[PDB]
């Protein structure tokens, strides 16, 4: 019962300011108790969309009114709605490797999904023009999983591509954008756009706890119109949660958590990358480590990825391989999530991995 | 100021918010370590078990935790459901019915047949003739009509489902918690032989509408279909699921439902009393045995839509029965009584008289 986690699917419980979250919950519950008897506006409580709208416009340069926002019980519930609002026969394009869960969702709605390989600047604009889709889904802040940060040149190329023809859209999945380490934040695709072909998506999962389940998208007027024409939708976030968040942002706590955690995860990432280069001696390559809460390790070895996982499992080390992110070569890679990982476990973790890779 | 007869509204005053927060803090510490991990996709095991125990006591639903899927309101579970059912399915809903679910189904491509009501719920005459694959029904308190489907028809429906393959029943037990001067009745799922019921429930009505915690129990066949996906993520907040586990397991839920059972019984009376006193036999009350609303038909020249605009003119929030048509010289209105304060009964009852007539 003594595991260590390099899992990317997990967060620190110890570092979340939970006592502050509950304080904001009470402050917020008292001020609006009245209102929790009525069901929330389908898009989300106005003031909550307002609170989120200021923040992302501050932290990422997103241009939007709160009327354009939809909240939010996780991305898949917004992405599902979004497919229902984009044209039924529209052809989707995802990164390769990609957020496989979203691929599976798109396939499960029987949508055609082309897959775009990546280059040094991220999702390839050559492959996009070659494969001629209608809807890109891209992770510019920290490509998931490869880690690549999309430079501004490529952001523009994608944007030019989207207004060459009508009925083309970009879904900017800004997952894991809150932290960026030895570079400055690049502002969002959505900020650079002048023609409103971007659907900006975000989540508080990464910056709070995975267990909270509050995410949001910003819809361009055309698609917002489409949303409003359905009439039947019902909000998926608990109103108390929506309000707790509101209060957690406005009070300044969220902004304070972000600054404290930015520092904490920068130090843990240094510690960990230093540790890895040490007990792997250069047999390792470390990729995509300037943002997010994971990076890639590529190892020099015979052993099949699948066996390293079995061995790692054997040594009580939770860990995942890159093959997981294939939508559709003897250098196996792993994903190293440094969110839950305690600093006492670093050394021991970097040992267990060296034994898992060799034995 | 306003007086609400909205069926879309609820307690606040009569919901133990400090207890809720107490169960939360208790659950929060007992399980703090586990909030760094995402929930099991079907919902936290301990929380499904808690709900699985409760629904067997309160409704006679017999099932394993493993078959339950927790989600953020019925809509999201309903969406999931359609993706698990065959894909070309033909659906069938009560007419009048839950229009939002109608619109979700049309919108999703589905052929959806409407099905008239008789004195004992969803016709079955209609069902057998019109030959659909999937039924959606509301046995405990029809939405909107308020008819309590009795045992005989629950049997009829099961037998319809039982006597041919690939027929399903969606048992939408919305608004079950309360039955006043009558017996509560076993659910279709509990009377089921071959597992062709999908029992769906929700905590929206018994807690606050705000909360967003609902559940559906799947047949093995469909559960194997859910597991073949393997991408879904939970939509309920882990804290909320844990707070709900604590609310049920500590007796505070059971307590709350008893508290509200009495408080809603004596406030349903004080209302009908006042209506049949401020009208006479000019008001017919229908479907007022279960749930948290009834209907009222009014003998009057004014159409439904004039009676609303005049009642809305008097700050009296109210919704009409034509809202629930999927597709008369007697108008009929829905009378939610969950929010309604007692001091406003007599005065709302009056404001409705003047908006019926002039
Ligand atoms: C690329 C990408 N984009 C968006 C999301 C959105 O998450 P949502 O809004 O919260 O529903 C995820 C979640 N991805 C999940 C793993 C995916 C996988 O590898 O199977 C992991 O999510 C979390 C991990 C740690 C802490 C908190 C959350 C995404 O990997
Ligand atoms: C038939 C039926 N089945 C299920 C549900 C439950 O939806 P869920 O709460 O998201 O799981 C409702 C809620 N229907 C809503 C809309 C009615 C309308 O369209 O006018 C009314 O819901 C609430 C009202 C007060 C307090 C709590 C809920 C349903 O009318």
Curated annotation (Swiss-Prot), chain A:
The keyword DNA-binding applies. The modification N6-(pyridoxal phosphate)lysine is found at residue 206. Keywords: Activator, Aminotransferase, DNA-binding, Pyridoxal phosphate, Repressor, Transcription, Transcription regulation, Transferase. Its cofactor is pyridoxal 5'-phosphate. GO terms for biological process: biosynthetic process. GO terms for molecular function: DNA binding; DNA-binding transcription factor activity; pyridoxal phosphate binding; transaminase activity. Activates the transcription of the gabTD operon. Is also a repressor of its own expression, both in the presence and absence of GABA. Binds specifically to the DNA region overlapping the -35 region of the gabT promoter and the -10 and +1 regions of the gabR promoter. Principally regulates the utilization of gamma-aminobutyrate. In the C-terminal section; belongs to the class-I pyridoxal-phosphate-dependent aminotransferase family. This is HTH-type transcriptional regulatory protein GabR. It comes from Bacillus subtilis (strain 168). The lineage of its organism: Bacteria, Bacillati, Bacillota, Bacilli, Bacillales. The chain holds residues 107 to 470 of 479 of the full protein.
